[PDB]
Amino acid sequence: GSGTILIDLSPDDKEFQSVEEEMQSTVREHRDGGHAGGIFNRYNILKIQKVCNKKLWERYTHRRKEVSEENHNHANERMLFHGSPFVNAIIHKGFDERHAYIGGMFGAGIYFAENSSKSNQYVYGIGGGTGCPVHKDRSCYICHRQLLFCRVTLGKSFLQF
Amino acid sequence: MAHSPPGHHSVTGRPVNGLALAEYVIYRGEQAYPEYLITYQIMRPE
Ligand SMILES: CC(C)Oc1ccc2c(=O)[nH]c3sccc3c2c1
Ligand SMILES: [Zn+2]
Numbered sequence: 556g557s558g559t560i561l562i563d564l565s566p567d568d569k570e571f572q573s574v575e576e577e578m579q580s581t582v583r584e585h586r587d588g589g590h591a592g593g594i595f596n597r598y599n600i601l602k603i604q605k606v607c608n609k610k611l612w613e614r615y616t617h618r619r620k621e622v623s624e625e626n627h628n629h630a631n632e633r634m635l636f637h638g639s640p641f642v643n644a645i646i647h648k649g650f651d652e653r654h655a656y657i658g659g660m661f662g663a664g665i666y667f668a669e670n671s672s673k674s675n676q677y678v679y680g681i682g683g684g685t686g687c688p689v690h691k692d693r694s695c696y697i698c699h700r701q702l703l704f705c706r707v708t709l710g711k712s713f714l715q716f
Numbered sequence: 717m718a719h720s721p722p723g724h725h726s727v728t729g730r731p732v733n734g735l736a737l738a739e740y741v742i743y744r745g746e747q748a749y750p751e752y753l754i755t756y757q758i759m760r761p762e
Contacts, residue, residue, distance in 0.1 A: 574752050583735055595758035602755040618746035622725050635740060646753060650745035652717040661727040661741040662718040669737030696760045704752035709740060710725025
């Protein structure tokens, strides 16, 4: 009883279609030639679920208002991808310091990507880890993967080139 | 978990000669909500 329920979207639902389009359209080629995330130009979407948690939603909107009020009423809210082996803990208990990338280029925080294929490099761990649990294949075309499509408050963002 | 740069709520990693889109970092778990869980396979190029 975490409070989290998952609601399946019909493929016929405009919401399913717009989320799929953001997933498919933000695939790119990676400088590792597919080492971390595998070799692919597109996905087979199997399911899209709405994550519903009243407590975690209120936790988000409370912080969003704090940021907004520090930034001329501008949350600077984006929809961004997150890949992680801990997506199950994230949807039940929320993001916290245990989801931080300690070794990240931009410091020990929680990372998000505009490129779905960037988040795909992290579903099996940092640099793809050892790949899918069943076949130990970072480029496995068989095993089901999960990504989060997340509402993220950026507020005033520090621009690192 | 580190602190956001003084006077900031997040970091934007701006992308070398690239087609790459931006990456972002938050230092508070409360600044993200996991709206959608997407289940998928990567597809072998033809
Ligand atoms: C390389 C860095 C600048 O950008 C990213 C972009 C996206 C992600 C992501 O979706 N999940 C995870 S889990 C640990 C790190 C990351 C990550 C890092
Ligand atoms: Zn596999």
